[PDB]
């Protein structure tokens with residue numbers, strides 16, 4: 001068939017919401033498992049499936065017909081579906097992460113390869129010799145951290161906890177990148193009574209400070225009461241995304257998803273260094289070597305989308321994938337691209353038409369459109385999200 005309704009994987013990671021996908025989309029969860037990620041794509045560990053037919057892996061379907069399904073551009077640039085499209089349901093706060101830049105990704109990938117670390121081992125931090133974009137788009141109000149605050153904001157936030165650690169006093173004395181770097185490494189490396197003393201100072205502050213980011217620290221502390229990452233909302237921008245707002249997650253930049261439901265667009269294979277809010281051991285020298293200690297003003301956090309007719313594009317400084325929202329009307333509009341696409345119903349209801357074939361998508365449902373089947377006409381109400389390739 002021209003248009004293929006997707007059967008998608010739900011990853012039941014423990015931090016997932018037992019209700020979100022069900023409440024929002026009516027996805028069945030009789031056993032009340034936590035449902036953390038809904039995957040739409042062709043990841044080798046869990047490809048989406050299509051039916052027509054028997055059920056086949058989308059990955060297997062693409063592999064047998066790359067140019068026809070991916071399009072020439074993608075078949076030749078990437079040799080596979082270059083994006084993975086997720087619904088994320090964060091019921092608990094997740095780890096602080098840093099994605100290394102292109103150069104350092106090549107090195108760490110090679111280091112781990114030379115060490116003979118299986119690509120799907122838990123020890124594996126680098127799974128791609130490249131850096132690629134990651135886009136998060138809020139479906140419900142979405143709490144997160146992203147990037148270092150302006151130095152003067154950090155100074156103001158650290159004052160109430162100046163006595164927690166000498167590294168904090170050190171930074172306040174000269175609030176610059178070097179000392180911010182030293183502060184970040186010192187906090188992460190706190191041990192024993194040094195650590196517990198610092199956390200005691202922070203906890204006392206939680207009792208005499210109001211509003212954000214103190215409230216976020218309190219929320220996080222319920223899950224990570226003994227984590228040096230509790231200091232992080234004082235260093236990093238805490239953001240509350242309204243539904244329909246999005247952020248691009250740059251290289252070398254600490255970020256964390258704390259609560260809510262979001263769409264995420266990424267590559268299949270990524271590199272992750274942890275920077276707190278984790279029971280895993282962190283290699284601090286490596287983390288610090290891969291972080292860029294420069295402030296990012298809050299006014300620059302959201303990606304500014306571009307509206308053209310019924311289409312709202314979210315421009316991405318990368319060839320690997322593109323992301324747009326399409327407002328549906330009862331009169332058909334053409335949705336076309338020179339690549340494979342995944343269309344996901346955000347809300348309302350979508351009817352997709354290709355000549356004689358019609359395909360209905362209720363919210364939470366998605367379809368794969370092969371490059372050779374573009375365009376399709378969409379009508380209905382609400383909004384359709386599309387991941388594809390602009391090349």
Ligand SMILES: O=P(O)(O)OC[C@H]1O[C@](O)(CO)[C@@H](O)[C@@H]1O
Nearest residue numbers: 099131132133134266267270271
């Ligand atoms: O899967 P993506 O696109 O890489 O997103 C996750 C992140 O991990 C990285 O691969 C690490 O370099 C980044 O490219 C990316 O920002």
Ligand SMILES: [Zn+2]
Nearest residue numbers: 097134249255
């Ligand atoms: Zn990330």
